């Protein structure tokens, strides 16, 4: 099984590649423009680094789709300010360039495992966002923050249509704030790591304040990467072909917190940490979609999966690794 990861040089690429290389029947083709995040797999016999950029290359990516069996496109900009500061580039990369890769899979009859986004639900009023039943709610066109949500949704619909009409084999997945070791940088155009926890950990690391937009009462769910990657690994395995044509939220709905509470949890774990003294004093909380909890019935059904790691162990492990790998001279 040849697995093509586009945008391997990051969080998901790292953790997914580790997982697949444990198993004896995977060849991982990791496409990216750099390899610093995964440099320890470069010498692995079943890892294959592929030089590339999905905006520049046509034929090279197309080739690698043909060569491989399953494809995971992880290249996208999901930086909120960018939705308003550089909307065209968000659209071009996240929509147009990924659409080309989708069409390569259709053409060579390959399976695609596509990262949809939890942002597709928008201001959905269900308490549990359900992939198969929840209505998707966005604001008017004069609220440009929604361009990312709606680009990703239209891409889902296009995948769905290729599936219905052209026999594309797909699974869509929606990560909810995955977190752990080897988080993407905040401005890396790679899907997967919780931007909210990376930002907060960054605040503590830099000694900048934690912004609570309107008191930080908006609630989010957070998912350990060990749980998340286990689910994604099962989607890849696709026991019984039970993931075919499915849309699967992957998150831990019991790991719910407002940004305020997430703030306090991180701070507690931080102040307790043996390396805390390398970092500045706490600059403080700064007052400047109200809920986003996944239904995980689809993951229960298709993957026989449920999350095993509590909030506190994921927080602690995520923070610990981040602090330990910070370069203190830079």
């Amino acid at each position: 099984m040849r697995v093509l990861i586009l945008g391997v040089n990051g969080f998901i690429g790292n953790h997914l590649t580790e997982r697949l290389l444990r198993e004896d029947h995977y060849e991982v083709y990791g496409l990216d423009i750099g390899s610093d995040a995964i440099s320890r797999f470069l010498n692995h016999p079943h890892f294959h680094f592929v030089e590339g950029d999905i905006s520049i290359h046509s034929e090279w990516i197309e080739y690698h789709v043909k060569k491989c069996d399953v494809v995971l496109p992880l290249v996208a900009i999901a930086t909120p300010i960018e939705y308003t500061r550089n909307p065209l580039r968000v659209f071009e990369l996240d929509f147009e360039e990924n659409l080309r890769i989708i069409r390569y899979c259709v053409k060579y009859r390959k399976r695609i495992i596509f990262p949809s986004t939890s942002e597709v639900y928008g201001m959905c009023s269900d308490k549990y966002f359900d992939e198969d039943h929840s209505n998707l709610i966005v604001g008017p066109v004069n609220k440009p923050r929604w361009i990312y949500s709606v680009s990703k949704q239209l891409l889902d619909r296009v995948i769905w249509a290729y599936g219905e009409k052209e026999g594309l084999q797909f699974t869509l997945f929606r990560p909810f704030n995955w977190m752990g070791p080897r988080l993407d940088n905040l401005n890396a155009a790679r899907i997967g790591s919780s931007r909210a926890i990376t930002q907060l950990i960054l605040n503590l690391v830099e000694g900048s304040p934690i912004k609570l937009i309107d008191g930080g009462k908006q609630k989010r769910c957070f998912t350990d990467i060990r749980d998340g990657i286990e689910a994604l690994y099962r989607i890849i395995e696709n026991a019984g072909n039970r993931c075919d044509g499915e849309i699967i939220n992957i998150g831990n709905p019991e790991n719910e917190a407002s940004i305020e509470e997430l703030g306090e949890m991180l701070l507690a774990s931080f102040e307790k940490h043996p390396l805390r003294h390398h970092f500045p004093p706490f600059a403080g909380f700064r007052v400047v979609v109200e809920h986003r909890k996944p239904s995980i019935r689809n993951a229960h059904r298709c993957l026989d999966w449920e999350p095993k790691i509590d909030m506190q162990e994921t927080i602690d492990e995520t923070l610990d690794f981040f602090l330990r790998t910070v370069d203190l001279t830079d």
Binding site: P209, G284, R286, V288
Partner: protein, 291 residues
């Protein structure tokens, strides 16, 4: 005495007016296309031919100027090189009006640089134009004091007033003939280039007084001194210097005081990005600053 004049800005306008009041016959005025007076409008109004070529250092212009047969040439804040092939056409020579106490501050923007450097005085100098730019002998020099509260625009008006006073007596003197000029001593000269946006960038590790002078040097209508709050640019339009924290850190937000390498700088008024000007306290909130 007939003359060909190169002029721009308020200094250009007052120089033309002074030549006219002194009885000079202005055959043509060379200026530039664009708060100050327009030399072109003044020329157009006085019925004096006016040209604004981007570059006169070409035989086309040498010949046009030669045909005008100037006895003398004057440069009043013209911004480009006027090469010797042109200046040598005037038997009585060429004279330039420069806004500094030459030999100090030769070059560009002496109005701003004297404020940047916290000088307590500056002046206007009328000098002969020789091969080397801004280095010719001095016909007369008039000093003015720079007050602690002067900013670029108030100093500009003082310089223009001094220029008017200087020209009113020196232009008739030149009309009478060569004046014994005062040589500039090269070892005492200083030269400045055109200011780049980087030259008005506030670096908080510096003394508050130096930063305050920078604010004064490019205050409105000039572009303003600027810095960043992370990735957000802001401009400090007016400031005040105040007599134990990281430089650049916020000491207080109302009034907005920023710690400097020495002392603190109060941002009295400023703006965030291309936003509107506001009092420092409001700017602090706009920028998300806290003590």
């Amino acid at each position: 005495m007939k003359t060909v004049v190169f002029a721009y800005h308020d200094m250009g306008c007052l120089g033309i007016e002074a030549l006219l009041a002194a009885g000079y016959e202005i055959s043509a005025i060379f200026t530039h296309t664009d708060f100050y007076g327009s030399v072109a409008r003044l020329a157009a109004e006085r019925g004096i031919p006016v040209y604004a070529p981007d570059n006169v250092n070409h035989p086309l212009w040498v010949e046009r100027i030669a045909q005008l047969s100037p006895d003398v040439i004057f440069s009043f804040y013209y911004r480009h090189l006027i090469y010797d092939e042109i200046l040598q056409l005037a038997p009585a020579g060429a004279f330039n009006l420069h806004g500094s106490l030459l030999p100090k501050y030769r070059g560009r923007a002496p109005l701003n640089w004297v404020l940047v450097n916290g000088e307590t005085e500056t002046g206007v100098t009328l000098h002969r134009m020789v091969k080397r730019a801004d280095a010719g002998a001095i016909v007369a020099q008039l000093r003015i004091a720079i007050a602690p509260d002067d900013i670029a625009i108030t100093l500009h008006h003082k310089l223009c007033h001094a220029a008017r006073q200087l020209l009113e007596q020196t232009l008739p003197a030149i009309k009478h003939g060569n004046i014994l000029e005062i040589a500039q001593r090269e070892n005492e000269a200083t030269c400045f280039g055109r200011r780049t946006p980087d030259d008005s960038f506030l670096e908080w590790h510096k003394p508050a007084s130096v930063l305050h002078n920078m604010v004064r040097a490019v205050a409105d209508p000039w572009p303003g001194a600027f810095s960043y709050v992370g990735n957000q640019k802001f401009t400090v339009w007016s400031s005040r210097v105040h007599p134990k924290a990281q430089p650049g850190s916020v000491i207080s937000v109302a009034p907005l005081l920023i710690a400097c390498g020495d002392g603190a700088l109060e941002i009295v008024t400023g703006q965030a990005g291309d936003g509107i000007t506001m009092q420092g306290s409001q700017l602090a909130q706009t920028l998300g600053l806290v003590q």
